[PDB]
Amino acid sequence: AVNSKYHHSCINCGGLNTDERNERGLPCEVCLPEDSPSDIYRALLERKTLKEYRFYHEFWNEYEDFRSFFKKKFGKDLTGYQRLWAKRIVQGKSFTMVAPTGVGKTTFGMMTALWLARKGKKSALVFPTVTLVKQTLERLQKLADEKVKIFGFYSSMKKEEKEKFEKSFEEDDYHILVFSTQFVSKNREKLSQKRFDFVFVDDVDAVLKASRNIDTLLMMVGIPEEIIRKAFSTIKQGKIYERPKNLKPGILVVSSATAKPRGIRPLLFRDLLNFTVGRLVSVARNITHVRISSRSKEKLVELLEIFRDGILIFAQTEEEGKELYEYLKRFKFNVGETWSEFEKNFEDFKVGKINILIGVQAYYGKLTRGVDLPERIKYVIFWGTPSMRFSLELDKAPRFVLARVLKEMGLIKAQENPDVEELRKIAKEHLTQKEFVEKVKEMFRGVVVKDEDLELIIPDVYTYIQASGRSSRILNGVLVKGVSVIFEEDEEIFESLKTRLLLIAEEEIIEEAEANWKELVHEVEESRRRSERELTDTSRSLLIIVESPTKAETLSRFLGRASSRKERNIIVHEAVTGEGVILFTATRGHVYDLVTKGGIHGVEEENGKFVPVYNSLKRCRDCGYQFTEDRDECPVCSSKNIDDKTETLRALREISLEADEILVATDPDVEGEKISWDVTQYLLPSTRSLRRIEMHEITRYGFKKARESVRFVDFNLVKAQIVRRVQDRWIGFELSGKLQKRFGRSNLSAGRVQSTVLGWIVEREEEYKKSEKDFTLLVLENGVNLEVEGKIADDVVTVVELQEAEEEKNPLPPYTTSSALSEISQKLRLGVQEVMDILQDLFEKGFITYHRTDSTRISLEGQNVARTYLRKIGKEDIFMGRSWSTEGAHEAIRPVKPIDARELEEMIEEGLIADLTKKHLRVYELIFNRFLASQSAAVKVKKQIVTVDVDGKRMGIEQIVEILRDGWNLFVPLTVSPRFEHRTYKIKEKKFYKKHTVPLFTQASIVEEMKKRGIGRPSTYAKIVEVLFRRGYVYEDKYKRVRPTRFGVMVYSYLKERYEKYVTEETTRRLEEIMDKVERGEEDYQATLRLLYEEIKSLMEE
Template sequence: MKVMIVESPNKVEKLSQILGDGWTVAASYGHIRDLPKEGEKGEAVAGISLDTFEPKYVLVERAEQHTIPKLRKLVAQADEGVWLATDPDREGEAISWHLKEVLRIADSRYTRVTFNAISASTVLGALEKPRKIDFKLVKAQEGRRVTDRLIGYPGSALLREKTGNRSISAGRVQSPAVRLLAERERQIQVFKPTNHFGAEVEFDGWKAKWDTKLFLTGDSEYILDAELAALAASCRDFTVEASETKPSRKAPPAPFRTVTLMQGASVALKFNPKKTAELSQKLFEAGHITYHRTDSQNFTPEVLAEIRAYASERGWALPEKPRTWKEKDSAQEGHEAIRPTHLEVASAGDTADEQALYKLIRIRAVVSQLADAEYNVTTVRLLCAQGGKSFAFGARGQQCVKPGFEAVLATDVTDGDAAEKTAEEGESGAVPPLPVGSQILALDGRVSMLKTSAPKRYKAASLLAKLEALGIGRPSTYPTIMTTMFERGYATEEKELLYCTPLGTTLVVALIRNKVGFIEYDYTCELENELDAIASGRAEYLDVMRRVNERVEADIARARADESTNTAPRFNCPECSKPLRQIKGPNGLFWGCSGFDEGCRYAVPDENGKPGEKPPAYACPECTKPLRRIGGERGYFWGCTGYADGCKVAFPDDNGKPGKRAPTPPVSAFKCGACGNGLINRKKPGKYNFWTCSNRDCDKTYDDRAGKPVEKKAKASTH
């Protein structure tokens, strides 16, 4: 038997059909190991050795209990070998390595295969190109995880010290993303709109706009004189100063890569990046599209030939040669652009949303290889003397000569920015070629009331596009960036627009004020490139990690030494005068004395980030020991601190103080079979009845049957 292990269970059925008899396909359900959430005692960065920078992995709970035992049995039965076929990126490479290590698969027994699409030709072709795990890719993935912690743990600790806010945290990619929002928020807040004027005149089927530059003086950018604009709008008798008609070409848009798919789906389908990522994952796992986490915007020669043949059969215009696009320097995944696995399939997906996204991907893949749209573009410049002044007007119009790709994609509904820009600039209509020096009469004119606009707020997709332009983040991280900002309270979204919260502003201001390197765009971009270099073998893992750690430690030490950047108020203990510190306990935030190790037990609740009042002491009415407020799954209650000594007194919580105890149910005539004392019928409202012994030292309990106590049934043995 041959065993193939993939990440997602959604791939299992289709791959089993492709591979046929003799194969068993199983899923790892993603990662089976991860870094621990909590570090060991004295560990500066959880799960990371600062000597070797080697991660200390722990098993994921779900995998430990379910996945790994199942996979171990299959691996033991795999007498013809194990194929590790996790996703074709760094994350997938790392998962294959974890599987090999945890399942103890010998080098001679495993084969690593990757496929960019779940189709018979691609999968069977991949089996003919077996290889071993690429440890450079594994180290590149580890480098990102380790770097996130080398930056996140000490960076977050610094932020909490400087701001006094225990809920704030830093991140390698997250913090620069929040900075973009904070800077845009500031630009919008300080923006002051300017009301200004323009003018346009109308002709038969076209119009011309007033060129205001001739009237701008000094540093002025706008016309503020309403009378001057009215004079311009009254122009009627024009002389043609210049007229020119030139050919123009418009190329089709490139195929989708991860970030442009997220942008396109956001504009055309109103899907946020997380939803687009989830839908494209399902389409990939079902075998409908190629791998969706990619930086590339090119296809293989075989695919280009297939698309050109498909277009030719339908009579669509094609360029002389297949189209290719220059790749970004940071493109590192080595995959082709996103496309349908079967071009002839017009609709695919189990839901309406999946089908809509598939259609978007398919049409973009085909259109990207069609011919340019060709136009004749006519521009004219008109002059008019009016009221002793000379006014110039301009017009631009275009006429389609050959539709090219626009015969299939009349309007690119995925390019919202281009659509808005065209609407703002506006075409002048069917501008005719005019003889230079000729006279032309305007039919009408009007003043344009204009107002400058504040910078536009980011949308989720445009923020990711900005991060990509800055070289920050990679395809597999984009949805996580957005999710993290929302979950941690740094950003909110209203009607698709992103707003930076006060907490987000606090984060950014504190990092900039303390001159921490990872908040700088250039530093984060350079670090991304270094992590990419590990994958290509141009850099060593240990060297990169050491440089990152040294930089972070230096930044943190310098910032801690500069007390002028502290914004957190200082509170001292009223009992020993040592500083109080805000602490996150199991029941939430509270303030405790920093002299705890010296014996000071002063502690008070947190009230809006400040030490609150010390709660009054309440004594147990039975043993006189202090009562304490305890938080449980069902809320708070008050219990006796003498519980370990046998005092079981408890009270409900009544707005922060012990409430009235419920009356003790009467002792019945039924006797306890263990000690002979009377039994008490305990009723759980809306749930069930049961019986307990009135003797507090007796732990005997009974089930209730028709109002009578009965012995509990012993559980059946599993042996």
């Protein structure tokens, strides 16, 4: 712990508790004075302070009973899925049953109904077919005791049972009633007027077949049609509705929606039961993609001879499908078809009568609405790459083509016009067909331009992912293996497909050389027969907490958002994986912050040591003002519409009860570690299993490598965070007051570093006017311009000495935060803050590595990315992998996937991935090129050193002329220059001036400088500059240089004259150094706090 207080963190009284206690899962000292109590419930009860902890006691107990019961009555222990479901059931919550292929939902429904009836609760079990009713009642009756009233109703019911069921359902206080969906639809009013505690729906689609059934099931727990209609109007509007707080409904549990949840009705579940009926989208895949270079039917024969059984062939059209069908029929392969005898051959393949199924992209994917058995399909063969093809003529041209062409050429800026209208608008301004197709082949990167027959081929990656996916799912708890083979000869098509497959599914496609058919086939078959065996289940449920919604979005993009429980302030998404369930949600910022109320500006002091005091953050959703103090309205605009992180915290504590294991996934810096602790400490009394993962990339790889590096919270980082926060708080408050009493305004000083930097700017203005040395620029004939000492007047430049030399130039190291901010904000007309934001969205959308790094280090994986990209662009002979550094916390800012900017633009305009402005693309382009340059070979250049005489003065100038050998200059342009000859160059024009030796600052220059002096950190740079701007201390001029204003000069003059100690560069650097030492556990937390306090105490007297 870090010895600090959190205002609502008591598990039992709901009030203030210390970090150190929550860490041990204890209630506050008020609730329980004892140091180390033996049993928490017992001790709370003894002292009569037992309040909310009861809830948890009763929870755990009432669960462990269930489990026990389940383990007794049934074979063995609960599976992870059923465990999560159980834990949700004792809370009385309603939900969808998201799970893979038949994990046993009916078993859980049965044992739930049994365990409930054991107390006295009445439940209902609904099934689509009338046979499932029979079977379920069968299985029920033999395991249920005499105390359980069991009835049934279906098609082939009797002549006195049909009425028996009705009278008993009318009066006789039943326990468990098993019936069809038909009965629900038919006897709506009868059920609607009855109240069930548990309702289990096996097939949601059958019951969602009618709109009345929604209101029926809703009225089967005790909800009037008034709330239903009100909620209906609200969902007809387009926003959310809220349930009356005075409602207690039963437990409705349903399975996953097969078809898309079409209609307006299901939204009533979102408001009355707080659960969304989702569909089962599983992205869990174990597929190996191999590519063969030639469409030779001999290769296909050999392959089929290896695979032998359960093969699925896909053809471009039906013509080549039939052709291949005939060729294989002749060669004595047991084969079937989809276009002629669909069902026959399909089910004959399902049984085993057929070894090879040949279909089309259009026939199979639209007629397989029947079954699609996964335990049979091992191999998928693609006879050509699935793709959409367009025509490249003046006519027959789509929208996006003419769009990307004209927008870049001349006609379009950013606009949308009717297609044929656009054709008729370019029908006059274009030149030729040749020039058109050339513009297409030059502009469009990432696709295939068949200029031969005038065609554009775009590989359909989605279709490939689906079709390939048909060979690998989860069966009997086992993620079985599958091989996907592609027969493609055109290198452009294959490369396109591979890039977009890496972009969406992050899956690699290998070559026939690096693939052993025997081994692969073996893995496939063996995993199959491993799934055939009797299952033992080790699936666990997992909760993952991150801080920003964007991370959660892109996480849901590769984990798959099946369903989403809305829990107070937050929206927890759930996904199915091969290792179990996986829940993830976003905090939306920080949770706790330093209080302003008491002590020394929030920091209290007891027993010689300092104790930080935090309270939950509140953000007005209207004006945007943030605060810590507990108020009902916004302290500024007096509005009640606020966001309260305490609600978020409570919600998290609620979710943490379902999950077996929890992982906090905040950014890998001090800030993130602080947040992670604020959360883990709060949750720790509730859940025993809490750990930390640091994701440097937001991709499947970043996540996997994060989980391999799981750990507990590092308290030195928390301590560091705290120390800096306290310095900014104390120094900021004191200096800001001292300025309140001098310049009127209230808030002015955010800290010490800010002031230091401002000093740099202010005094830079003074040492800029003194560097004013007179100069003169000379435009030369048959050459470039030349810069020489002022006041020249001979109009004749002579050449005296002239020599040349070859040199090998290494590239610049990869971007760090300072470097990135500087160069990117310089090359673009953007501020460092804008750049920083773009970087943040870039990392959080899983496109680059962590954007806050002070290391240039690069791993084998990064070098690997560079390597594969160079091998993709052909120039792989210029690859030179460089680690760049061994001393490194994280890597440098680099791309995560070998995809350049142009390809990204292509995928964006196409619609694969979205949400990237032009600026995002440009910044990414800079990062990418810098990284590859850093991974490219050294450029060998020839430069010359020309000594020229100008009016009695010898001046030498060195310039690059020839690039004798390429390297990294392909990504980062290396400027050449016209040669000087040993003659006499005459001056054309003399532009006299006096530009200063020591120039002014720019934002880039400032970041560079404070990096160069040891002031600030990667997370603070841009924020610092922006703050300087927002406080009016500084402005930008014509050529965008940073200049101090009146106010800034006044402020730094005052501060330097009076408080020179707390603004001096030496002091700031010494403090940065010492705190950075605290971060590494080298300097003492409490001691540096003592120091800061001791200088503050001195300041509070001036």
